[PDB]
Design a protein around this nucleic acid. Structure first.
Ligand SMILES: [Zn+2]
Ligand SMILES: [Zn+2]
Ligand SMILES: [Zn+2]
Ligand SMILES: [Zn+2]
Lengths: 76, 78
DNA sequence: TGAAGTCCAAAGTTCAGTCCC
DNA sequence: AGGGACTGAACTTTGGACTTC
């Protein structure tokens, strides 16, 4: 099973979508800090294993596209 | 532990070797900008906390000899 | 046990001081 | 004078290892 966000190896369902440990942590931290970030390009950046850290905005957007929900992220 | 490159205090393992923040930073920049340093002397310069900035060629050479890996340096990001 | 959570080593970024073109 | 480059410390983000409900 591959990560629905970046294509890396998936470790199971996280926050509503199958994803790797990276996209898992990235999403949780983003939601808890209520970050939306911003893209400096056309908000259509390539989010794969190698470039996932190049644009937080696009990575986060794809997490939501993949099915992740803020609702699934807990406080603390 | 100490920096395997210059002897200064090590802040942990960096790019594969125990090193300080100075050598950590130096290696990263050297790799990302693919700088081709040269040595004015015999390429046997002593690299310590004191002289580390005297010869970039030898400090980089020491970095690789100490275990730092080019592959461990990631691409710059925002 | 599934899917939340936490921990933390090792990546990354910014920038003041300082000097060269 | 404006443009550019380097160093290393302060501080943040990443993601794999492990823990709780
Ligand atoms: Zn992923
Ligand atoms: Zn983008
Ligand atoms: Zn050092
Ligand atoms: Zn030298």
């Amino acid at each position: 099973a591959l990560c629905a966000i970046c294509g890396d190896r998936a470790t199971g369902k996280h926050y509503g979508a199958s994803s790797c440990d990276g996209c898992k942590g990235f999403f949780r931290r983003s939601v808890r800090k209520n970050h939306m970030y911003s893209c400096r390009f056309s908000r259509q950046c390539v989010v794969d294993k190698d470039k996932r850290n190049q644009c937080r905005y696009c990575r986060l957007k794809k997490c939501f596209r993949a099915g992740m929900k803020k609702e699934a992220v807990q406080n603390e």
